[PDB]
């Protein structure tokens, strides 16, 4: 057996509020790459089936992610942990967003929404995001010190979402408020947030925006999404509203935490930080994502019996892909535990395994990371941390709530 405590759960929020279970992930990769992770009664993060299969190897993650005909996202959602007492109804509302849909409903939705993540559309965000990144850094440096997460990591990913959706300036304040109130409620610091409230307001704003853009068409990404194409396909108003609700999560706390941990990695590896400031290599973004793995894990449900790397997975059983483990697989990376911002190629699964659900925002994310870290180098090159970062209590998100930091040194 793999050497692990009894009653160990890799989706336990208690661990991730403290640390990442890196030694435990390494143990499984070596001794039990696919491992039944049982869960005590009542302690199933919202799922009362007794446990799941841990998936720790990159190739195993990639097999599951491409075989979405077997490994469903609809059946139980992809989030592997909620509050233990969460109602089944609240899990199943996730199916209203593309992420938790299967083919063919996902296939139709992904093809329409692809019209918003063309390389061309993302490039029109470059200039506005670059200028904001620069001012965010200058504003942060001028403060001398403070919470790096709030002052450097927080704002720009939200600007990318708002700029992509063309949200007018005056509306961005409440849009950021709602977007930031969607996850993390298992952490004591956010016990009082109601995601369903903010989501219903997000959908209302998103649907009103889509009604208005129909009446007054433009050359935005919104109007391309709600008016029909060759096949007569388009998002109806509520579907656009579920698209916005998804964007408010999928591209917010993820890029946020990659910026933070990416800076956390440059503190720990001064060699890489000195190198970065000199060459500003855009390969850093991928290494920063591999290092940060903002989504520790996503799950699937096997719709039929399936044999994966010599392990019989039974219909209805859950498999949880631990991207945190896959991104440090010794069989795929030379030195996984070397932060190397020049690593090329870099086949990390930070954006998920390739397949139907592979992150549509991967290139926007990489651009956001590259702009903000260029701005950090321009305005805050001698960044020194004050105190140790404060981790987020979450079973699937690898979050940093706060990080006290001096920008002058």
Ligand X SMILES: CCOC(=O)c1cc2cc(-c3ccncc3)ccc2n1CC1CCCC1
Query: x/- contact string, 74-103, with ligand HEM (CB under 6 A)?
Result: ------------------------xx----
Give Cβ neighbours of residue 21 (< 8 Å, ≥ 6 apart).
10, 15
Q: Is 184 annotated as a binding residue?
A: yes
How do beta strands 34-38 and 51-55 pair? antiparallel
3-state secondary structure string, 16-67? HHHCCCHHHHHHHHHHCCEEEEECCCCCCCCCCCCEEEEECCHHHHHHHHHC
Q: Which of 51, 195, 361, 399 binds ligand HEM (CB under 6 A)?
A: 361
The pattern of x and - marking residues 315 through 354 that bind ligand HEM according to CB under 6 A reads -----------------------------------xxxx-
Residue 183 contacts ligand X per CB under 6 A? yes
Indicate the residue whose CB is closest to ligand X: 250
Question: Where in 232-251 is the site for ligand HEM (CB under 6 A)?
Answer: 246-247, 250-251
Q: Find the binder of ligand HEM among 360, 367, 375, 392 (CB under 6 A).
A: 360
Residue ranges in 276-335 that form contacts with ligand X under rule CB under 6 A: none
**Are 244 and 202 a contacting pair, CB within 8 Å?**
yes
Torsional sign, CA 232, 248, 77, 70: positive
Strands 71-72 and 384-385: unpaired
Q: Which of residues 295-314 bind ligand HEM (CB under 6 A)?
A: 295, 298
List the Cα angle 85/89/95 in 5-degree steps: 120
CB of 184 to ligand X, least distance (A): 10
Considering only residues 198-227, where is the footprint of ligand X by CB under 6 A? Answer: 199
Query: In angstroms, rounded to a whole number, what is the distance separating the alpha carbons of residues 240 and 227?
Result: 11
Residue 139 φ then ψ, to 5° = -55, -40
Site for ligand X in 38-97 (CB under 6 A): 90, 93-94, 96-97
Q: Are the beta carbons of 55 and 327 closer than 8 angstroms? A: no
Question: Which residues, 6+ apart, have CB-to-CB distance to 361 below 8 Å?
Answer: 117, 247, 250, 251
In terms of CB distance, is 199 or 296 closer to ligand X?
199
How far apart are CB 127 and ligand HEM at their closest, in Å? Answer: 17
Cα–Cα distance measured from residue 167 to residue 181, given in angstroms and rounded to the nearest whole number? 18
Q: Which CB, 52 or 276, lies closer to ligand X?
A: 52
Taking CB under 6 A as the criterion, the residue among 133, 160, 210, 250 binding ligand X is 250
Asked if residues 254 and 295 have their Cβ atoms less than 8 Å apart, the reply is yes
Q: Give yes or no for residue 112 binding ligand HEM (CB under 6 A).
A: no
**Would you tell me which residues interact with ligand HEM (CB under 6 A)?**
65, 98-99, 110, 161, 246-247, 250-251, 254-255, 258, 289, 294-295, 298, 350-353, 355, 357-361, 364-365
**Would you tell me which residues interact with ligand X (CB under 6 A)?**
90, 93-94, 96-97, 99, 182-183, 195-196, 199, 245-246, 249-250
Binding residue ranges for heme: 359
């Amino acid at each position: 057996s793999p050497n692990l405590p009894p009653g160990f759960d890799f989706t336990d929020p208690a661990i991730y509020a403290e640390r990442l279970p890196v030694a435990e992930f390494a143990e499984l990769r070596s001794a039990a790459p696919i491992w039944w992770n049982g869960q005590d009664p009542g302690k199933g993060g919202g799922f009362h089936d007794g446990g799941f299969w841990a998936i720790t190897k990159l190739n195993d993650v990639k097999e599951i992610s491409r075989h979405s005909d077997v490994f469903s996202s609809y059946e139980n959602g992809v989030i592997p942990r909620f509050k233990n007492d969460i109602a089944r109804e609240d899990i199943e509302v996730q199916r209203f967003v593309m992420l938790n849909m299967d083919a063919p409903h996902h296939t139709r939705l992904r093809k329409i929404i692809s019209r918003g993540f063309t390389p061309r559309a993302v490039g029109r965000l470059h200039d506005e995001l670059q200028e904001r990144a620069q001012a965010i850094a200058a504003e942060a440096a001028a403060a001398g010190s403070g919470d790096f997460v709030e002052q450097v990591s927080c704002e720009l990913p939200l600007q990318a979402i708002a700029g992509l959706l063309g949200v007018p300036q005056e509306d961005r304040g409440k849009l950021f408020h709602w977007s930031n109130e969607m996850t993390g409620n298992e952490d004591p610091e956010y016990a009082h947030i109601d995601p369903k409230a903010s989501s219903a307001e997000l959908i209302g704003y998103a649907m009103k925006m889509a009604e208005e853009k129909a009446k007054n068409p433009a050359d935005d990404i919104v109007t391309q999404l709600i008016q029909a194409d060759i096949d007569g396909e388009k998002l109806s108003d509520d579907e656009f509203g579920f698209f916005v609700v998804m964007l408010a999560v999928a591209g917010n706390e993820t890029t946020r935490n990659s910026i933070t941990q990416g800076m956390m990695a440059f503190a720990e590896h001064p060699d890489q930080w000195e190198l970065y400031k000199k060459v500003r290599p855009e390969t850093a973004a991928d290494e920063i994502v591999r290092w940060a793995t903002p989504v520790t894990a996503f799950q699937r449900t096997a719709l039929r019996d399936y044999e994966l790397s010599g392990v019989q997975i039974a219909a209805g059983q859950r498999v949880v892909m631990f991207y945190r483990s896959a991104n440090f697989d010794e069989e795929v990376f030379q030195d996984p535990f070397t932060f190397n911002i020049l690593r090329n190629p870099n086949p990390h699964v930070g954006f998920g395994g390739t397949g139907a659900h592979y992150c549509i925002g991967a290139n926007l994310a990489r651009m956001t990371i590259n702009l903000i870290f260029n701005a950090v180098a321009d305005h805050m090159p001698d960044l020194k941390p004050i105190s140790a970062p404060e981790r987020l209590r979450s079973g699937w998100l690898n979050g940093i709530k706060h990080w006290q930091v001096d920008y002058t040194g």
